[PDB]
Amino acid sequence: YREYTMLIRDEVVKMLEEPVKHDDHLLRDSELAGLLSMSSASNGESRQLKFGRKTIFSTKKNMHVMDDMANERYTPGIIPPVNVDKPIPLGRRDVPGRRTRIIFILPYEYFIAQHAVVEKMLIYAKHTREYAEFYSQSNQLLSYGDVTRFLSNNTMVLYTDVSQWDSSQHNTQPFRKGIIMGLDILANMTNDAKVLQTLNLYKQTQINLMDSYVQIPDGNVIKKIQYGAVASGEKQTKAANSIANLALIKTVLSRISNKHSFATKIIRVDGDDNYAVLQFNTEVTKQMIQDVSNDVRETYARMNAKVKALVSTVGIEIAKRYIAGGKIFFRAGINLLNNEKRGQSTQWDQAAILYSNYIVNRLRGFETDREFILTKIMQMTSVAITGSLRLFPSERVLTTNSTFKVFDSEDFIIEYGTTVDEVYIQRAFMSLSSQKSGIADEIAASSTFKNYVTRLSEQLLFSKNNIVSRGIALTEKAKLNSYAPIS
Amino acid sequence: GKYNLILSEYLSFIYNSVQIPIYYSSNSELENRCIEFHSKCLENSKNGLSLRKLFVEYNDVIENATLLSILSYSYDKYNAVERKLVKYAKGKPLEADLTVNELDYENNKMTSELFPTAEEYTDSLMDPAILTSLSSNLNAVMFWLEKHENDVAEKLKVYKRRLDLFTIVASTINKYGVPRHNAKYRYEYDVMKDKPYYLVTWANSSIEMLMSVFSHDDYLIAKELIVLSYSNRSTLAKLVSSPMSILVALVDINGTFITNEELELEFSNKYVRAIVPDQTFDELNQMLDNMRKAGLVDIPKMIQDWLVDRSIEKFPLMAKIYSWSFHVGFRKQKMLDAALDQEMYREYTMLIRDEVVKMLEEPVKHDDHLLRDSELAGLLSMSSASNGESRQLKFGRKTIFSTKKNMHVMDDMANERYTPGIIPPVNVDKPIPLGRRDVPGRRTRIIFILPYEYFIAQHAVVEKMLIYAKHTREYAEFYSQSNQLLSYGDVTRFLSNNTMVLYTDVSQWDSSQHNTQPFRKGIIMGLDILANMTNDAKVLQTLNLYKQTQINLMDSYVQIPDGNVIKKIQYGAVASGEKQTKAANSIANLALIKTVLSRISNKHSFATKIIRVDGDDNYAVLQFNTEVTKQMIQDVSNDVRETYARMNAKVKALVSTVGIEIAKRYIAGGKIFFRAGINLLNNEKRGQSTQWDQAAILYSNYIVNRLRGFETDREFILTKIMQMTSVAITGSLRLFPSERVLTTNSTFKVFDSEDFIIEYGTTVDEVYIQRAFMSLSSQKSGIADEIAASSTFKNYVTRLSEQLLFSKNNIVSRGIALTEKAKLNSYAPISLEKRRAQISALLTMLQKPVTFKSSKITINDILRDIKPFFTVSDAHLPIQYQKFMPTLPDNVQYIIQCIGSRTYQIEDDGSKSAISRLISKYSVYKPSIEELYKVISLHENEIQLYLISLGIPKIDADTYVGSKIYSRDKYRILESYVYNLLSINYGCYQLFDFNSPDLEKLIRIPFKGKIPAVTFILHLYAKLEVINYAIKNGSWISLFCNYPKSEMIKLWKKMWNITSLRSPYTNANFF
Amino acid sequence: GKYNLILSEYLSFIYNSVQIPIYYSSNSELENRCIEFHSKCLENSKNGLSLRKLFVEYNDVIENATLLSILSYSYDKYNAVERKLVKYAKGKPLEADLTVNELDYENNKMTSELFPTAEEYTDSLMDPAILTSLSSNLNAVMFWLEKHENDVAEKLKVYKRRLDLFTIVASTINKYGVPRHNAKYRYEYDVMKDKPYYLVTWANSSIEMLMSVFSHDDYLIAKELIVLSYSNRS
Amino acid sequence: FETDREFILTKIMQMTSVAITGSLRLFPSERVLTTNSTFKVFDSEDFIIEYGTTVDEVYIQRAFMSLSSQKSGIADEIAASSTFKNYVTRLSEQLLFSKNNIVSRGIALTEKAKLNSYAPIS
CATH class of the missing domain: 3.30.230.140 (Ribosomal Protein S5; domain 2)
Known part of the structure; x- marks a missing residue:
């Protein structure tokens, strides 16, 4: 894993080489940025809180910062240990046709110590084609065209399914070693306390992780076993995962070269799949593909990693898209009548979501009869005013472009008030669009909210910032509803 | 989208006895389908039949329509908390060591002890002051645990930690039961009588913190604070935080950002060795010992481990502690106790006077119109004025209890009582009522309550003072549009191995009885110098009246309560409550450091690179003609402290070479840090906000914390919003608003569906609903109109205008009326009338719209x-x-x-436009961005009259109307208006x-x-x-x-x- | 933001017998959460159960949504004024020197004197003409005093002044009781018949002025005008 | 003259509230009360006027405009009699030549805007 981890570290450095020496303001003030980002942060345990003179069960990580700051408990410089003493709760992600995967549940100190670095990492990715997921504003079509591009009778394509490898206990040591090693190299590049502070804190996240215990339930009881594998839940997850996956293919591809001579035309990563089109100084024979595939699989095997290493000359399949016959294909299996998890959406939104799902499927392939969908919307939107009187909303109410719009009167086509009635109703609907919450206001009434906002601003403003200040408050008052008692 | 579904779990969780979702849609056909689905659902449920078939029969509604809210038919008692809590009451209740609080009532005794009788009880010492219930928090916490009782790996560990801690809360609460809250979300005497007085607030803080834990360290921290706080309620927050000031000095600086000539943060590679003297280390040890001798164990240990290498890389932890110490609650002591804490000033007062003069030197000689008409400006400002006693009033044929200072002017003008030239004496005869300000980890401070004559005699002068400050960097709070980042960069700027930084904490000095004489003498002296600079009666009248405010203050008695009785003691200290407070305070603080810095110079020779003030902190970076030695820092600090001592002033004078700490921001390691402790489940005071606004405020607070450091789990916050927004239409039917209703950008928007990201109606439904919500946005108040119907309101408006207008000003006139009709609601009978009435409209609004013009x-x-x-x-x-x-x-x-x-x-107010400057140069009036926006959108002919109507000279008014500058000004007004609507200056965007x-x-x-x-x-x-x-x-x-x-x-x-x-x-x- | 919370004090102050906040939001998911929180709140209250647990279970609603209004379930009679006022009726009622007004009816006589019979009475000479009640003003004034009964330093002095003066109003009004207002916020003949005709308007003006005092001078002024106005009305 | 702002807030609280039952009053919130609309009573900070910056304010802002102008079952019938039609036409006949209706539509509402005054309509 010397070759493998070495690339992971090096990739980390490039992504953060120029910013570190210059002493990027983002790196220096990483704490404020991560703090601000919380709205787009993961999730933590549904802790207990008190604001003013009441109690709540908020699970949102941002609010935790509020309770902690207004309680002298807030201490980001000290990132909670994720081991036997204070293990990691657990979250999950289900998907049809695949073993269930777990999701960590690290506290907020972790997101804060990871937002700036990852964000800076992504910018590098943003302009690097190897990362087919980030590059520019690129859509899946660009990725599709790139593969067919070099396909010729003298070049074979190779795709993989490193999903299991990303959680292989073997992977964690290298993965963590490389990230930490790079942070070390970057730290010996600056003399800025703010940056070094950030460079160091990120390093610690990896060290605490190196040995992480999991609060795994086992019935109405909560067991507590160890865990030497890497899971998702960190900011760097999606970004760092790619770095590793890209690092892996580079390692396998170079090793196989020892035997056959090719030419790496393109190399790419995409979550749980990494591919590459390599050209050969001669025509591709069945024997050649069989040999390379074997050499590739054995190589993957040597690194003790479970993977689906296939090889072709005209097509590739991966989790997001499959190119069969030179044509681009997308899977179309989004369960419509069985959701993955019970979120916080409402029955109405549930329907608008169902219609959204239906359209995506129709576009991709699978097509549930539209009459059936209309029926569901009829069932899902209706509301009862009495025990023997339901009120089924009309098509105009349902499709008119508003905050309650569920679908379209003609799939793929969006209409806009053209008649007087549509506009008459259109202006009328906006009225009762945002109705205050007898909780979302009082919360901004406690010293906690005021201190948190002011505390964040005091290190963000100089003059009379209120245009900025007014927005930050609503930024929270827009997510706060999440909390059951408010939603 | 996860919020709507999550809400379902919460409802199913609480109720075990129906859930009737409600879908709306812009689409007309779908809408009728929605109504059919809704109608059938009630019938099925009110008949005890399934609903699975109906949902299949309305897949179109579920999948294609929007969820509007989820009705809940219940029939229990909402006493599920008593039953659920017991499962977690397995731990052993906590026993408070009633021998910890210097002030008896600060101790967590039994309520029946602190208040033997009902007429003696007063939640005035522990009131969460928040419109949410303790049971709700307990309920919300239990919901999370039920949901994450099976999480695995690291997620599980968060649960084990959360599970453990919560037990401390459940176990203790269980012993006394879960306190019942009344409609006003207060806690009466009967419920409280047999329970540990400080129980409810404690549970909120413990719940707020335990639902903010993730890593092991969070747990020890939440755990130590949670436990000690139960008994210690007067020094835990101060003790835990205190050492942070010394710690910042400890770490070096490996590359930091600075402020370049273009006043923009610039990355510098500079390196500075954080050198500290031996004695300074001892000071830190004592802070650690005091923490130790006070019960602490793990937290002190953590700082101790940190001090072995003092690596900024492991500083994040030190920060979590300082931020966390604040979430222990608000130190709410008895008003009197708070009040009780309260030759060589020639140099000091002399600077204060001189500073006052500079701020008002040019304006006075020229005879600024603002100074001349100061009475109108102060009168107009009232909307942004402090507060006075809730007097009694009569307008038309009724009576009200308004506390707003502006209305007092109305009653007095329409009663011949209005007499600003005569500013009420604030002494033994007519003492000063009192207000207060609480903050975690600090002795309670009092706030005067001077009448309106005082604000009026202080608005123009202060406003003119601020303009000077506005362009003077010494006042790091006012300077230009400067944000805290500029202030941060300025300090690191000159930091070198030949320059030591010095910070202070003059908070106590600003209220030191010693300070009042100098402070007042300097302000009055300057006014005297300025008065002998003009011959304008209007100005001299204003210059003199301001002087008197100081003289009446020199000897001010305080109406300090002491039980159900209102005592009346003296008061030789200065407090806040005057316009000049924040501005004048700075003048004094700046004056103080200048005095100390000059005196210390007598010994060592340095170079004052930068000097700054900021409320209760003032600092300065001084350079030395040689390398800084530990001995040197020790000597200067001593010389500084002794100097502060000579002036008999309690202060925290520290000194470093790489970092500084102050009330607003701490710079440890060359990196800028902000505290993150805004109590979320315990508010400071009970304002006039509503339950809905309370939630939007709570979410605001949560985001600020996340951004700063502390992070309460977002799921918990979603739960609170679910509890706080819901409204009941019957005694067994609550209506929980949907995610679309809650996050869609409107006047009821509480949060965002993705923190830090603001969305805007892109789909037809969002806009359909968006236009619909605006409708019932502003609903008249059957009080706010009649008030403008009395001769009082009409006389007051006309009286103000008659000295403000010439032509047909009504564009200006219409705005002034609403300016009052926008705050008037404050008055309970109006805020409550509007709030209660809004519910009827809001509930009906979700029902059926489809008819909006x-x-x-x-x-x-x-x-x-x-x-x-x-x-x-x-x-x-x-x-x-x-x-x-x-x-x-x-x-x-x-x-x-x-x-x-x-x-x-x-710039989000148009303040930097030529038209605005012109309106300001001649008239005292101040039109908002909205007015400038509407005015700018007018025809050249109309705009010209507007300027004349206010007073701009015609030669000058005509020049603007044509001029090229006016055209550009049309662009700038729009820019400010747009940026305002995008909150580009608030939220997280202000950092981009x-x-x-x-x-x-x-x-x-x-x-x-x-x-x-x-x-x-x-x-x-x-x-x-x-x-x-x-x-x-x-x-x-x-x-x-x-x-x-x-x-x-x-x-x-x-x-x-x-x-x-x-x-x-x-x-x-x-x- | 202080207005929404202040309103809570006022409601809790007036009602002692529930308060069901109502939150709305543009966010759709939060909105359903708001509805759930609202629905459960009615059920809990109409069943005499707590609500502390529910608020914790809806921190998102309190913190992130907007307050739309605050419902109030009461069951008394809104006659809390009669009871609250007595605490302040300690002072000695004022007696109007009916020998001050050149025009007889300008004098603050007993209504039954100026208008012996009901068909003769006419509030046309003292009608506040405002759609707010005297009891409300009295109620509003009492609320401020309860809230600022412990203020310290100079703030307290404002209270002492406000406290003193108000007593003049409370003491005088108490002697005749607090006049009841009808839907039209007018003051009929029966209520007025045994009270100093110019009482209601006077109380409004006295309340308006005493709630406009801050410095010592304001007090003397509010005090002198308040007293002389009771008899002098011309 | 300055009446304590807290007192004014109290009056607004009393004056705005509305009862739906005999034992249930509905006190409108600060957002409902100060948000710039046809029901706006005051400002959350005297002398300063705000404008919807958050999604909620705008969401509510568009919603309030809806029920802003609700027809009067009197102000319409009045324009239905020959009297109103004759009066409008009579005034216009000596004011117009071509197809004036832009002007004509306004005159009618000019009256339909004050007509409410009449008690039975207000």
């Missing part, structure tokens, strides 16, 4: 138009800027790493450099025509879109725009017809 356009409508013309394509941005605010969540920090950040505020060269490249926009308006919005819309994508993806996207020339004209019309959406809770503005 929309015609008004907003940002939602404008932005929706531009969307289709933007072509997005993957782009890439490298991370180049280092980190300086290490706490920022990774997704937020990433944007700064790529595009950078600004150390300035974006929106003019970043790096961000600008990602946007592509051809100039179809030199039309500054449209080119502007397309660009800003382009920038916001790219930033938001960055936050929600970690990758960048590049946008292209081919907006047709024809489309631009249609869009141009829309730009001057955008209305607003009030919701103030959204307030995230922290630095």
